[PDB]
């Protein structure tokens, strides 16, 4: 996260770290959506142009973390993966369309003050909150600058951007399965996700029921926190039918 701040303890209890077993390193962010299911970006697991193709036994999920590098004894919980599910129409060839994946844990994780699932949006919540100008929150342990790494989880609030502005900012083909967020040059304030924040959640707090909903997944961008560029996020609600199908069949 660029131009963000340190998270508060327990501020993002659904934040998940995807952790590579060998060598031991951060792979991506992700989010906890139930006691057995974790949501992330497909490109965190599969990206052939970079020779990336992780299998279940390659990875661990670390939940309840704050410190990036420390083993947070008696606080974090570490889970093994039972199975990965990548969206069958994930477009890694072109533009990361449908950049979404689920991971089922071998065993249910125990909820605590530091570990708790985020909600997924219904159609109405999405319609009401996914509007240009409305701000969401992105969190992660990714890079602090485009070209170091944070001691603890970082947070930044960013406004959703009008679709035509998103489209005009890039040469990449944008789809209905993505949205973009970030400040415009004229707005003065800044902030963005970056490398390492991939797969982490873009969340909004519903003013109707005061619950946090995950509207987006950190997906792609051109550099980080560049003037006139915006971060792109997987549109979680648009892909919710796939999410439910996977959980219904394999849960």
């Amino acid at each position: 996260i660029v131009e963000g701040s340190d998270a508060e303890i327990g501020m993002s209890p659904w934040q998940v770290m995807l952790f590579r077993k060998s060598p031991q390193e951060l792979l991506c962010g992700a989010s906890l959506i139930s006691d057995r299911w974790v949501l992330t970006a497909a490109h965190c697991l599969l990206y052939p142009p970079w020779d990336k193709n992780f299998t279940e036994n390659d990875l661990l999920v670390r939940i309840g973390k704050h410190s990036r590098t420390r083993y947070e004894r008696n606080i974090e919980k570490i889970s093994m993966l039972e199975k990965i599910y990548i969206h069958p129409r994930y477009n890694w060839r072109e533009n990361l369309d449908r950049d979404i994946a689920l991971m089922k844990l071998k065993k249910p994780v125990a909820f605590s003050d530091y570990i708790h699932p985020v909600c997924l949006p219904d159609r109405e919540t999405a319609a009401s909150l996914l509007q240009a100008g409305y701000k969401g929150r992105v969190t992660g342990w990714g890079n602090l600058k485009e070209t170091g790494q944070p001691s603890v989880l970082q947070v930044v609030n960013l406004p959703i951007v009008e679709r035509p502005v998103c489209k005009d900012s890039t040469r990449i083909r944008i789809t209905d399965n993505m949205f973009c967020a970030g400040y415009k040059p004229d707005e003065g304030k800044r902030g963005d996700a970056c490398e390492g924040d991939s797969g982490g959640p873009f969340v909004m707090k519903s003013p109707f029921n005061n619950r946090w909903y995950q509207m987006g997944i950190v997906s792609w961008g051109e550099g980080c926190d560049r003037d006139g560029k915006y971060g792109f996020y997987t549109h979680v609600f648009r892909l919710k039918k796939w999410i439910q199908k996977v959980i219904d069949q394999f849960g």
Binding site: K21, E25, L60, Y71, I78
Partner: peptide, 11 residues
């Protein structure tokens, strides 16, 4: 860079 995790999780 990262602190070592308990061996149980790597088994």
């Amino acid at each position: 860079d990262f602190e070592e995790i308990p061996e149980e999780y790597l088994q």
